[PDB]
């Protein structure tokens, strides 16, 4: 799974459009883009009826930096969306 960074836009869900994440970890930088970790929030999006946020949920909890699980491409979000893209430099399996 490709590593998801701070600029990795989301895939969106339902009537709520896509959005980028706003938080990251400075301790690890890949190609100058800091890494995305658990507990970090996506921007808000709305379907015109209600506003949804989003929190990443890692599926590779074995590998942690700063003691928190690392999020990659394909992991669902607390708002129902999913990771859409990642950097091909690093792959985790």
Number of domains into which the chain is organized = 1
Method used for this model? cryo-EM
C-alpha 63/C-alpha 69 separation (Å) is: 6
Final resolution, Å: 3.7
C-alpha 60/C-alpha 15 separation (Å) is: 29
**Residue 2 belongs to domain with CATH number:** 2.60.200.60
| Residue 53 lies in domain | 1-93
C-alpha 80/C-alpha 33 separation (Å) is: 25
Contact 20, 10 (CB under 8 A): yes
DSSP E strands: which ranges in the chain? 2-3, 25-30, 33-35, 45-46, 51-52, 60-65, 68-70, 87-91
Q: Take residue 52 and report the two structure tokens written for it.
A: 């949804």
C-alpha 32/C-alpha 12 separation (Å) is: 25
């Amino acid at each position: 799974a490709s590593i998801a960074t701070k600029d990795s836009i989301c895939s969106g869900h339902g009537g709520f459009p896509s959005r980028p994440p706003v938080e990251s970890e400075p301790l690890l930088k890949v190609n100058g883009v800091e890494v995305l970790v658990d507990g970090k929030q996506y921007a808000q999006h709305t379907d015109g009826n209600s506003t949804h946020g989003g929190q990443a949920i890692s599926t590779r909890a074995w590998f942690t930096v700063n003691g928190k699980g690392i999020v990659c491409v394909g992991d669902p979000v607390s708002c129902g969306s999913t990771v859409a893209a990642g950097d091909g430099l690093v792959q985790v399996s």
